[PDB]
Design a protein around this ligand. Sequence first.
Ligand SMILES: *[C@@H]1O[C@H](CO)[C@@H](O[C@H]2O[C@H](CO)[C@@H](O[C@@H]3O[C@H](CO[C@H]4O[C@H](CO)[C@@H](O)[C@H](O)[C@@H]4O)[C@@H](O)[C@H](O[C@H]4O[C@H](CO)[C@@H](O)[C@H](O)[C@@H]4O)[C@@H]3O)[C@H](O)[C@H]2NC(C)=O)[C@H](O)[C@H]1NC(C)=O
Ligand SMILES: *[C@@H]1O[C@H](CO)[C@@H](O[C@H]2O[C@H](CO)[C@@H](O[C@@H]3O[C@H](CO[C@H]4O[C@H](CO)[C@@H](O)[C@H](O)[C@@H]4O)[C@@H](O)[C@H](O[C@H]4O[C@H](CO)[C@@H](O)[C@H](O)[C@@H]4O)[C@@H]3O)[C@H](O)[C@H]2NC(C)=O)[C@H](O)[C@H]1NC(C)=O
Ligand SMILES: *[C@@H]1O[C@H](CO)[C@@H](O[C@H]2O[C@H](CO)[C@@H](O[C@@H]3O[C@H](CO)[C@@H](O)[C@H](O[C@H]4O[C@H](CO)[C@@H](O)[C@H](O)[C@@H]4O)[C@@H]3O)[C@H](O)[C@H]2NC(C)=O)[C@H](O)[C@H]1NC(C)=O
Ligand SMILES: *[C@@H]1O[C@H](CO)[C@@H](O[C@H]2O[C@H](CO)[C@@H](O[C@@H]3O[C@H](CO)[C@@H](O)[C@H](O[C@H]4O[C@H](CO)[C@@H](O)[C@H](O)[C@@H]4O)[C@@H]3O)[C@H](O)[C@H]2NC(C)=O)[C@H](O)[C@H]1NC(C)=O
Ligand SMILES: [Ca+2]
Ligand SMILES: [Ca+2]
Ligand SMILES: [Ca+2]
Ligand SMILES: [Ca+2]
Ligand SMILES: [Ca+2]
Ligand SMILES: [Ca+2]
Ligand SMILES: [Ca+2]
Ligand SMILES: [Ca+2]
Ligand SMILES: [Ca+2]
Ligand SMILES: [Ca+2]
Ligand SMILES: [Ca+2]
Ligand SMILES: [Ca+2]
Lengths: 345, 345
Amino acid sequence: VELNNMFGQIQSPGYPDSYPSDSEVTWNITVPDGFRIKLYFMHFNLESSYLCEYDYVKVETEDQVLATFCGRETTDTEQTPGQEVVLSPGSFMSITFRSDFSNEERFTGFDAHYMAVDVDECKEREDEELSCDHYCHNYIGGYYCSCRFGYILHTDNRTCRVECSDNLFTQRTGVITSPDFPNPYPKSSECLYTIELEEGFMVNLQFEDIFDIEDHPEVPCPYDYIKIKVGPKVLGPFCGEKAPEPISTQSHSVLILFHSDNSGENRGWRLSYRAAGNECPELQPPVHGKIEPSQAKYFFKDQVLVSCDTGYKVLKDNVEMDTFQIECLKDGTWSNKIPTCKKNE
Amino acid sequence: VELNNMFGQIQSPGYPDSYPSDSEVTWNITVPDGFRIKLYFMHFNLESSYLCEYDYVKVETEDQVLATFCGRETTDTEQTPGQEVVLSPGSFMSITFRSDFSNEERFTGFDAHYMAVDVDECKEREDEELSCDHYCHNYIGGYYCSCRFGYILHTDNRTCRVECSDNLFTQRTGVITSPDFPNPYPKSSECLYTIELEEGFMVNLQFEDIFDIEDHPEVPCPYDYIKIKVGPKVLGPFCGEKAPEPISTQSHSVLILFHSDNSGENRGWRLSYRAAGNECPELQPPVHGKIEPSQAKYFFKDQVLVSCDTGYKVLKDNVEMDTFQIECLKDGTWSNKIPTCKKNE
Ligand SMILES: *[C@@H]1O[C@H](CO)[C@@H](O[C@H]2O[C@H](CO)[C@@H](O[C@@H]3O[C@H](CO[C@H]4O[C@H](CO)[C@@H](O)[C@H](O)[C@@H]4O)[C@@H](O)[C@H](O[C@H]4O[C@H](CO)[C@@H](O)[C@H](O)[C@@H]4O)[C@@H]3O)[C@H](O)[C@H]2NC(C)=O)[C@H](O)[C@H]1NC(C)=O
Ligand SMILES: *[C@@H]1O[C@H](CO)[C@@H](O[C@H]2O[C@H](CO)[C@@H](O[C@@H]3O[C@H](CO[C@H]4O[C@H](CO)[C@@H](O)[C@H](O)[C@@H]4O)[C@@H](O)[C@H](O[C@H]4O[C@H](CO)[C@@H](O)[C@H](O)[C@@H]4O)[C@@H]3O)[C@H](O)[C@H]2NC(C)=O)[C@H](O)[C@H]1NC(C)=O
Ligand SMILES: *[C@@H]1O[C@H](CO)[C@@H](O[C@H]2O[C@H](CO)[C@@H](O[C@@H]3O[C@H](CO)[C@@H](O)[C@H](O[C@H]4O[C@H](CO)[C@@H](O)[C@H](O)[C@@H]4O)[C@@H]3O)[C@H](O)[C@H]2NC(C)=O)[C@H](O)[C@H]1NC(C)=O
Ligand SMILES: *[C@@H]1O[C@H](CO)[C@@H](O[C@H]2O[C@H](CO)[C@@H](O[C@@H]3O[C@H](CO)[C@@H](O)[C@H](O[C@H]4O[C@H](CO)[C@@H](O)[C@H](O)[C@@H]4O)[C@@H]3O)[C@H](O)[C@H]2NC(C)=O)[C@H](O)[C@H]1NC(C)=O
Ligand SMILES: [Ca+2]
Ligand SMILES: [Ca+2]
Ligand SMILES: [Ca+2]
Ligand SMILES: [Ca+2]
Ligand SMILES: [Ca+2]
Ligand SMILES: [Ca+2]
Ligand SMILES: [Ca+2]
Ligand SMILES: [Ca+2]
Ligand SMILES: [Ca+2]
Ligand SMILES: [Ca+2]
Ligand SMILES: [Ca+2]
Ligand SMILES: [Ca+2]
């Protein structure tokens, strides 16, 4: 007897009359995926025996015996089902009623009822793998995942990624971190951090605070990683609990690529960058004059104005002027030499 | 936007970005019969207004407004949904998101989730009509009724009838009742009680104890009733709280028909019957003899033996004998006259 549906009733042969001897009936119950089987009895009147060897109602799956019943509900300290519900672990349940050759006493058999019960994948998933990254939503026959505001559900319909490439660092100094640092970084993400400075600046990179990127003890960064592209060269990949040593580039532009796979709760990383340059030589103020601003050292694009004392003016070639402006160039040289001061005579 | 299924997600236009102005979207959610709609929100960010007149999320049925939401979940003492679930009374739910012409502030809208929820017809049915007579069984998408052991589920798939015609009363006296008397009699049943005595007996009927058959104040027995067929004549129908007066039939056979409809909890009835007959005249013992058994009155089929004293014998015609047997016939006459006793001389 084969049966696939959502509910049903099962009775012993002859019910409500006494069952015949030498009878064996099997009922196979299959429900769709995402459902389990719930079974209970309204009447149970069978012959009692050791391990229910003679007459019995056997409830099982394809590889597991769930329960075996016999005896009469009237007499107690018995192997009867009573008010107990039999729940299948999966979407299949097999029931066998067996009656041997000896039916001296007239037992009336049983009356059973079953139905499909929705599996709540959300309250079992935490004991599994392979569960919703953020939110889990249960429904009749299945489930689905959703994400926190500002996150995007990935192609796996499970993990929550972010858009982390809409950036451009143009300032002389700055801070760059993994998304939500130092909280666990978003899974299944591909972050592109771009540092773009003017021609002549050189970017220095320095990691700080927590550094936590998922790694492997034998294989170099097979899960998550940082790659740093400077010129036609890629540095890394970088991962683990130890940040790479400070990086001094000879470039005004740097690309930081941060890749995260579909697994882990690692805290991420943080770095600070600084745009340096070539150091210009010490400047000596002209006789009867001055140079502003007075700095210990001068770097690329630094501007200085040369001035003279009252009663004197700056002399360029054989031409007089109030101030002259010089700048520290990319190659580490000044735009011009320091001119002299000429009296008003 | 039309949507018929078991689950789903709904977002405001532009989500997760700010919604556009002058927009109006309606989502119609229909589920199969035996299901309701469950609705909740994960994000809600709207403009706040008196009775949500400007921007709003309106949740309604075909004839009833369930809820109206507006405002931002951040600010409290608001008209936001929060963690509250909106449950539809039936299998239909309509949702309208409206945005007016004024979207100065940039509200991010909403994120909603819905699913079909099984109706448990068993826990609401008692507040209805038209419910399971005995047992109610709930399942996903519907329900069904079943009956107590010894009862049969009627063609209405709701009421529980019995087989109450497998009887035959042949004894001189007896008791007949409605099934399970004095407990409520089974609905949708047709009971045939047959009294069959030998030719010459006359059945007398007498109701006793509780008499409770569903009746109507204006119409004679339109629901449940007793009909009594004696010969080619039917007595009744009988119903109500008052039993009919004792019935003296002139018949050895009586049929009692008891009809019960699909409604009520009336206790029923009980009667006792007695098979009478014609009374035979007083018998006088013969001179020098006796008659056994000595009774006050004699009725149909009563047997008596005529005997004589020691030294005498019964005389029939001119023939001597030890005992003579006479019987009380159907017509109220004796089979023979009392013979005399003759000495042994
Ligand atoms: C309704 O559900 C019922 C319950 O699941 C199912 O009934 C059967 O369930 C048992 C498990 O499937 C089954 O027992 C099996 O019998 C196998 C013997 O037959 C196979 O091998 C021979 C050759 O030797 C072939 O000629 C046959 O065609 C057949 O392929 C036996 O090999 C098997 O044992 C192995 O597998 C189990 C898996 O759990 C291992 O634990 C075990 O160690 C072995 O490796 C197993 O015993 C049994 O016959 C039957 N149950 C009863 C009570 O009779 C119904 O078939 C299913 N209905 C439908 C329509 O599919
Ligand atoms: C998706 O579900 C939506 C919500 O139920 C539904 O949208 C509509 O829902 C309202 C109720 O059905 C509807 O309002 C009705 O409008 C009727 C006016 O149009 C009718 O009459 C004119 C002639 O006057 C005809 O030309 C039209 O073709 C049409 O037949 C109006 O008569 C009606 O009011 C009566 O009925 C209600 C019943 O509850 C009584 O309370 C009331 O007293 C009146 O007797 C009612 O107001 C509305 O237009 C619309 N909602 C919105 C927000 O626009 C969708 O139609 C449904 N989708 C599908 C595919 O069916
Ligand atoms: C999260 O993960 C899965 C996988 O990303 C998502 O489900 C997907 O499932 C399949 C692809 O594996 C898609 O189904 C197909 O859609 C086609 C377009 O609608 C349709 O034509 C296909 O039907 C036929 O397919 C073959 C022929 O190609 C044939 O043998 C069949 O008999 C059909 O006639 C088929 O349905 C899904 O579209 C796809 N996406 C979605 C949105 O479901 C899910 O999002 C999700 N899964 C779970 C379980 O959560
Ligand atoms: C308790 O009450 C009802 C009523 O007694 C029970 O359900 C019954 O419902 C209908 C009769 O109203 C039956 O359904 C039909 O069964 C036919 C044989 O299987 C089948 O051919 C029919 O299909 C077609 O019907 C018409 C053509 O005649 C056509 O328009 C349709 O499109 C179909 O193609 C139809 O399904 C049921 O068989 C009947 N009995 C049962 C057991 O369901 C129920 O027992 C119960 N109802 C509830 C809700 O509890
Ligand atoms: Ca057990
Ligand atoms: Ca047995
Ligand atoms: Ca589920
Ligand atoms: Ca963010
Ligand atoms: Ca670790
Ligand atoms: Ca990882
Ligand atoms: Ca409310
Ligand atoms: Ca507005
Ligand atoms: Ca139900
Ligand atoms: Ca009974
Ligand atoms: Ca009453
Ligand atoms: Ca009635």
